[PDB]
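Researcher: Last one for today. Full complex below.
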Amino acid sequence: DYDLIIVAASALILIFIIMMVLTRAVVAAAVIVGTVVLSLASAFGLSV
Amino acid sequence: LGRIWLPVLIVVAVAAGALIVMNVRTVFGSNPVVVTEKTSDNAEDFNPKVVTYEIFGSGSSAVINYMD
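Model: Here's the assembly. Have a good evening.
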């Protein structure tokens, strides 16, 4: 449980930083991260 | 702040991630042994009740059995 929380937080922050650096935009990076998270929830549901 | 907004936000995000790591990593474990509490009584001898046995008769000697 604790490792899942840590991994999710660290990965999200790092991916957000990388996307913000590359696209030079904040809202675009936020949109990318949020959409990926929603897809992640759907994936969990389908696999379960 | 065209050239200042990016590194500041990067540092802020890194600090937040580091804080979360430092907390959650140390949350795990921290319960290897269970130690029960001790509550004993004061073992002292104040005002002890005194019991006295007396045997006496017209005879010379006697055989005596008693419970301590």
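DSSP finds one helix and no strands in chain B. The interface with chain A takes residues 6, 9-10, 13-14, 16-17, 20-21, 24-25, 27-28 of chain B (CB under 8 Å).
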